[PDB]
Each structure stands twice: as C-alpha cells, then as structure tokens.
Design an enzyme around this catalytic site. Structure first.
Site, PDB file in Angstrom:
ATOM      1  N   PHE A  70      59.585  98.457  65.127  1.00  0.00           N
ATOM      2  CA  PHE A  70      60.643  97.919  65.971  1.00  0.00           C
ATOM      3  C   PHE A  70      62.046  98.233  65.436  1.00  0.00           C
ATOM      4  O   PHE A  70      63.022  97.703  65.965  1.00  0.00           O
ATOM      5  CB  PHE A  70      60.449  96.410  66.177  1.00  0.00           C
TER       6      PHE A  70
ATOM      7  N   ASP B 289      58.653  93.700  55.303  1.00  0.00           N
ATOM      8  CA  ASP B 289      58.225  93.904  56.682  1.00  0.00           C
ATOM      9  C   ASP B 289      57.579  92.646  57.255  1.00  0.00           C
ATOM     10  O   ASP B 289      56.361  92.606  57.427  1.00  0.00           O
ATOM     11  CB  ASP B 289      57.301  95.119  56.819  1.00  0.00           C
TER      12      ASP B 289
ATOM     13  N   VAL C 227      65.971 101.668  59.158  1.00  0.00           N
ATOM     14  CA  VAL C 227      66.543 101.120  57.934  1.00  0.00           C
ATOM     15  C   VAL C 227      67.485 102.165  57.344  1.00  0.00           C
ATOM     16  O   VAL C 227      67.076 103.304  57.117  1.00  0.00           O
ATOM     17  CB  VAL C 227      65.466 100.726  56.900  1.00  0.00           C
TER      18      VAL C 227
ATOM     19  N   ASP D 243      50.497  91.220  57.946  1.00  0.00           N
ATOM     20  CA  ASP D 243      50.588  92.675  57.920  1.00  0.00           C
ATOM     21  C   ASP D 243      50.756  93.155  56.482  1.00  0.00           C
ATOM     22  O   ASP D 243      51.606  93.994  56.183  1.00  0.00           O
ATOM     23  CB  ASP D 243      51.690  93.208  58.844  1.00  0.00           C
TER      24      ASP D 243
ATOM     25  N   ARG E 136      51.962 100.011  52.517  1.00  0.00           N
ATOM     26  CA  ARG E 136      53.109 100.578  53.207  1.00  0.00           C
ATOM     27  C   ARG E 136      54.189  99.521  53.450  1.00  0.00           C
ATOM     28  O   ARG E 136      55.327  99.872  53.741  1.00  0.00           O
ATOM     29  CB  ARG E 136      52.692 101.263  54.514  1.00  0.00           C
ATOM     30  N   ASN E 137      53.831  98.236  53.320  1.00  0.00           N
ATOM     31  CA  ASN E 137      54.741  97.137  53.596  1.00  0.00           C
ATOM     32  C   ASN E 137      55.192  96.470  52.296  1.00  0.00           C
ATOM     33  O   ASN E 137      55.722  95.357  52.318  1.00  0.00           O
ATOM     34  CB  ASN E 137      54.149  96.151  54.607  1.00  0.00           C
TER      35      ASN E 137
HETATM   36  C1  LIG Z   1      56.289  98.966  61.183  1.00  0.00           C
HETATM   37  C2  LIG Z   1      56.706  97.889  60.173  1.00  0.00           C
HETATM   38  C3  LIG Z   1      58.242  97.807  60.130  1.00  0.00           C
HETATM   39  O1  LIG Z   1      58.779  96.718  60.325  1.00  0.00           O
HETATM   40  N1  LIG Z   1      58.942  98.951  59.883  1.00  0.00           N
HETATM   41  C4  LIG Z   1      58.292 100.291  59.637  1.00  0.00           C
HETATM   42  C5  LIG Z   1      58.780 100.964  58.333  1.00  0.00           C
HETATM   43  C6  LIG Z   1      60.336 100.960  58.267  1.00  0.00           C
HETATM   44  C7  LIG Z   1      60.824 101.396  57.021  1.00  0.00           C
HETATM   45  C8  LIG Z   1      61.109 100.440  56.034  1.00  0.00           C
HETATM   46  C9  LIG Z   1      61.610 100.843  54.799  1.00  0.00           C
HETATM   47  C10 LIG Z   1      61.834 102.195  54.502  1.00  0.00           C
HETATM   48  C11 LIG Z   1      62.382 102.526  53.247  1.00  0.00           C
HETATM   49  N2  LIG Z   1      63.048 101.556  52.579  1.00  0.00           N
HETATM   50  C12 LIG Z   1      63.626 101.768  51.388  1.00  0.00           C
HETATM   51  N3  LIG Z   1      64.279 100.825  50.714  1.00  0.00           N
HETATM   52  C13 LIG Z   1      64.471  99.594  51.182  1.00  0.00           C
HETATM   53  C14 LIG Z   1      64.265  99.108  52.410  1.00  0.00           C
HETATM   54  C15 LIG Z   1      64.629  97.832  52.322  1.00  0.00           C
HETATM   55  C16 LIG Z   1      64.594  96.788  53.464  1.00  0.00           C
HETATM   56  N4  LIG Z   1      65.031  97.540  51.081  1.00  0.00           N
HETATM   57  N5  LIG Z   1      64.927  98.652  50.368  1.00  0.00           N
HETATM   58  C17 LIG Z   1      63.552 103.022  50.819  1.00  0.00           C
HETATM   59  C18 LIG Z   1      62.874 104.014  51.521  1.00  0.00           C
HETATM   60  N6  LIG Z   1      62.832 105.235  50.974  1.00  0.00           N
HETATM   61  C19 LIG Z   1      62.275 106.392  51.733  1.00  0.00           C
HETATM   62  C20 LIG Z   1      62.149 107.667  50.886  1.00  0.00           C
HETATM   63  N7  LIG Z   1      63.128 107.730  49.776  1.00  0.00           N
HETATM   64  C21 LIG Z   1      62.878 108.920  48.946  1.00  0.00           C
HETATM   65  C22 LIG Z   1      63.014 106.554  48.899  1.00  0.00           C
HETATM   66  C23 LIG Z   1      63.506 105.369  49.649  1.00  0.00           C
HETATM   67  N8  LIG Z   1      62.317 103.754  52.720  1.00  0.00           N
HETATM   68  C24 LIG Z   1      61.557 103.146  55.496  1.00  0.00           C
HETATM   69  C25 LIG Z   1      61.059 102.750  56.749  1.00  0.00           C
HETATM   70  C26 LIG Z   1      60.958  99.527  58.548  1.00  0.00           C
HETATM   71  C27 LIG Z   1      60.437  98.889  59.830  1.00  0.00           C
END
Ligand SMILES: */C=C/C(=O)N1CCC(c2ccc(-c3nc(Nc4cc(C)n[nH]4)cc(N4CCN(C)CC4)n3)cc2)CC1
Ligand code: NA
Length: 287
Positions: free
Chosen positions: A26, A167, A29, A149, A153-154
């Site tokens: 939904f 998440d 980020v 959930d 991955r979460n």
């Molecule tokens: C479907 C469940 C849902 O609510 N979502 C799907 C996945 C989405 C998502 C969340 C987080 C990342 C993400 N986040 C971070 N850091 C982070 C996020 C938060 C809230 N606090 N810190 C870091 C990364 N990466 C990706 C690759 N990089 C090399 C390292 C950091 N990714 C991505 C997608 C949220 C919604």
C-alpha cells in the site's frame, strides 16, 4: 480530512525528502532528513524513513497507511520494533516518519551473507537475531497487538545489525478481528499463516507464534523460501495432514524442535512469546 493529533504532528517545512528505498503493498518508502525530530536537539537533522502513498494508490491503500500509523501510536516503544517518530497529516500528502534502518529487510540481508558455495553470519548471530525478534514479539503481545504478517521481509536491520519488526499494515488490536467472517485474514501470505486463521477465521497471539516459527526457519536457512517447491495452492492440505518443513542444516536439534513447537496443530499447544524469549535467552547465553 485526518483529525489533527498534535502530539505526533511534524512540520512539513522541516522535512526534506531524498532517494527512494523501495515500494510494496500500500505504499512507498523514501529516505529523508528531519530537522528537530528529536525534540531535545531542535536544530539537529536526523536521517529518517518516510512511508507515503504511491501515485497509483487506492482508497484502501490510504486506509492501510492510516491504520499502520495509528497502530504504531498504540504500541509504544521497544528496541526491536521500528520506532514511529512523527507524521505529516495536515494540508498535504500523508507522510509517516519512522526511524531509519540502513541495511534494509532481513531476507535480503541474510541472502547477501550466504557463503560462495558481504561477510558471514555465525550461529551466535542467527540465534541473537532470533532472540531480538522474540523479545519484540513478546512486547507486542503484551500491548494487545497481533502483527499478522511476521516474515523475514517485514524485519528491518539497522546500521548496527539491530533487528526491528516493521510493516504494521495488517496489525490489529486483539479485540478488533471480525471472528468467523469469511473475509477475515484474506490478506495474510499463506506460507507464514497459522491454519486456524484460514479454517476458523480467527487470529490470536498463538497465530503469530506459528508465523514466528516460519521466520525462525527463514533465519536459519539464510533467507530460504518456506516450503520450497510446494505451491501455495497445495499447502493447506499438506498442513492438515501434519506435513512440516524439514530441519535446516546449520541449526541445532533444539532450535528445530522449537520451530516444530511453534507449528503445533493445536494453537494452545504452541509456546507463548514469553516462553520463546526465556528458551532463546538460555540458548544464547550458552553459545
Ligand atoms: C507489503 C508490506 C508493506 O507494508 N510494504 C512493502 C515493502 C515496502 C518497503 C519497506 C522498506 C524498504 C526498505 N527500507 C529501508 N529502511 C527503512 C525503512 C524504514 C521504515 N526504516 N528503515 C531500507 C531499504 N533498503 C533497500 C535496499 N538498500 C540497499 C538498503 C536499504 N528498504 C523497502 C520497501 C514498505 C511497504
Ligand atoms: Na491513484
């Protein structure tokens, strides 16, 4: 639009959006700089993560993002849960501001640390990871929250390799499930889901414990995919017949028996999070 909640509100002029971190379900980020979000240091900029809608957002996506923000409020703080820092809820798009975990989700983290056959996980590391997540889940349970959930991955991993449950889009107060209604639990990923969540349309803490078993398996296989080669369409028949995933290689008999305990058919026969914490504490201490 959204009822103002001054306690959590954060000035938009103080937030500078940066590079995207990723996208799913939904939301989206993005990395960001927030000036004075730590109120004790009002001129300090902190790197944060901002969760917001994507351009092709639905009404339900907005609902989910609101629901997650509100849930983070009800839960309170804990070392192994991703900290809500604030929100921009007025006069523009909904921004939900979280603490920033640099290393991304645990599934990718573990996969990147598989040996050739960017460093290596020790056994003690895997057990530590497991223990942190059990403590997070124990705290959650005590706040009357079911996550629904739970999965590698979460989970997010910080710069210092601290595990943070994230998440909370699907998370509920334990009293706020529509018991026995056919639409209940229809959005939980099947391979991490307790059987009773589907067959009975209920969800208790003991359902989260089942999920934690699956998460344990993910950890010890370094980001393996649950039930490898078994299609989702065939899982629930196999589970009714008592089929369960085999023991991962770099895992002790003891830890596998704990997984199998989480996967007890009878929900009441599964350990509580409190019991899991104590057992993992004992094992971590010994290693
Ligand atoms: C479907 C469940 C849902 O609510 N979502 C799907 C996945 C989405 C998502 C969340 C987080 C990342 C993400 N986040 C971070 N850091 C982070 C996020 C938060 C809230 N606090 N810190 C870091 C990364 N990466 C990706 C690759 N990089 C090399 C390292 C950091 N990714 C991505 C997608 C949220 C919604
Ligand atoms: Na749209």
């Amino acid at each position: 639009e959204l009822p103002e909640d001054p306690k959590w509100e954060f000035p938009r002029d103080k937030l500078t959006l940066g590079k995207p971190l990723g996208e799913g379900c939904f939301g989206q980020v993005v990395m960001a700089e927030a000036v004075g979000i730590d109120k004790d240091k009002p001129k300090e900029a902190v790197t944060v993560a901002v969760k917001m809608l994507k351009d092709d957002a639905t009404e339900k996506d907005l609902s989910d993002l609101v629901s997650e923000m509100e849930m983070m409020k009800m839960i309170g703080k804990h070392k192994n849960i991703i900290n809500l820092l604030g929100a921009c809820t007025q006069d523009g798009p909904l921004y939900v501001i979280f603490e920033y975990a640099s290393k991304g989700n645990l599934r990718e983290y573990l996969r990147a640390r598989r040996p050739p056959g960017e460093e290596q996980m020790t056994f003690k590391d895997l057990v530590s990871c497991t223990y942190q997540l059990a403590r997070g889940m124990e705290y959650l349970a005590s706040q009357k929250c079911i996550h629904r959930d739970l999965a590698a991955r979460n989970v997010l991993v910080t710069e210092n390799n601290v595990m943070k449950i994230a998440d909370f889009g699907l998370a509920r107060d334990i009293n706020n499930i529509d018991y026995y209604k056919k639409t209940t639990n229809g959005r939980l990923p099947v391979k991490w889901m307790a059987p009773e969540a589907l067959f009975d349309r209920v969800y208790t803490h003991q359902s989260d414990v089942w999920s934690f078993g699956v998460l344990m398996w993910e950890i010890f296989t370094l980001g393996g995919s649950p039930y490898p080669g078994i299609p989702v369409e065939e899982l629930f028949k196999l589970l009714k017949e008592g089929h369960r995933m085999d023991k991962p290689a770099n895992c002790t008999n003891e830890l596998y028996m704990m997984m199998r305990d989480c996967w007890h058919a009878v929900p009441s026969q599964r350990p509580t999070f409190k019991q899991l914490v104590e057992d993992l504490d004992r094992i971590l201490t010994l290693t």
